[PDB]
Write a protein that binds this DNA or RNA. Structure first.
Ligand SMILES: [Zn+2]
Ligand SMILES: [Zn+2]
Lengths: 197, 196
DNA sequence: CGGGCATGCC
DNA sequence: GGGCATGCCCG
């Protein structure tokens, strides 16, 4: 019916994202390309995303992740797990089986299947960093490959990360492209080389 | 539990023939005598010829069923993967879960077995048309051998049985099937892997 | 159909 | 990491 905004918005708290530096060994479970602003990862493997802010949002602030198709031809379509993976019983105990994006390690995670847009998202309460740290790290998992037939079917996606108050009002927004694939190092390297040809 | 795959020509001298289609990369259906194996593309016509020495009785039928070839999966029902089951490729006769359809036969019947839950497709036996010495059935395979959540790279066999009207066996033959994007490429590859 | 390549897997 | 199996796009 409509399309979510993907416009970078630092907001009043100076909200931005950070990623580890991981390298490009042919596989490697998760690697991020600064050149492409694109995460490359394997199915069900830890994808760390760092949340950086300048002030600190109030308690009750939430951090939401949602996938959308990058291409305008599919952008109104909801990003979901393919029929196979939806039915494969790899439940972590909380994530519903149709959801592409999961959060690891957080008892307070909530999954939303919006009644009106039909879009899936996963949301955790915002927490300040630990002592000795400058950022909050969320561990995401992507539960289908970009290639899965009947699901993403090779269509590229964006993950939109939004900072929101308790009622769902926008406080900040950032995004990154993601490719979920068998060989993240190889594929990251390939796409970076295509940028130099 | 596993249906028999024992070849028997039975009293009517029942056996199968296949077109001799060669190995151009993407030939739609091609059969390897050395491998007794059909290689074919998803949803493309796969002609299977029925040859008999004498005409079986009125009411005879011809059934096709797929089974897994490897012992570790032989007990599992062969079915289409979750994706293909749900794609919009119905012919309005075949159940969406069934791997094997018959095209061009309004008298086709499909069965899910009471006890084994295996799928099959059955058509009336018809004698060859005038000028012909065999009867051709046009099968279609509706999932690739490689499909995740289904065959998932496990080899299958198709078992063709000739049956009387009550289902009693008159004859049986079988062939391996690989459903794939490039049947010629893949046949030539397999036949080359036979050699030292 | 199919050269050329994308993308699974070990 | 290499490679090889095996699928898809658009001419
Ligand atoms: Zn999937
Ligand atoms: Zn399939």
């Amino acid at each position: 019916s409509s399309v979510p905004s993907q416009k970078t918005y630092q907001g009043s708290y100076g909200f931005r994202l950070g990623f580890l530096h991981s390298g490009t060994a042919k596989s490697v479970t998760c690697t991020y390309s600064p050149a492409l602003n694109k995460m490359f990862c394997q199915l069900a493997k830890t994808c760390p995303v760092q949340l950086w802010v300048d002030s600190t949002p109030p308690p009750g602030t939430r951090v939401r992740a949602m996938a959308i198709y990058k291409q305008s031809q599919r952008m109104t379509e909801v990003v979901r797990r393919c029929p196979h993976h939806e039915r494969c019983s790899d439940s972590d105990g909380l994530a519903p089986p149709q959801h592409l994006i999961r959060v690891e390690g957080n008892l307070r995670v909530e999954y939303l299947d919006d009644r009106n847009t039909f879009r899936h998202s996963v949301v955790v309460p915002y927490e300040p960093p630990e002592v000795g740290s400058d950022c909050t790290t969320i561990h995401y998992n992507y539960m289908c490959n970009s290639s899965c037939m009947g699901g993403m079917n090779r269509s590229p996606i964006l993950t939109i990360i939004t900072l929101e108050d308790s009622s769902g009002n926008l406080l900040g927004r950032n995004s990154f492209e993601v490719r979920v694939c068998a060989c993240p190092g190889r594929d990251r390297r390939t796409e970076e080389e295509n940028l130099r040809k």
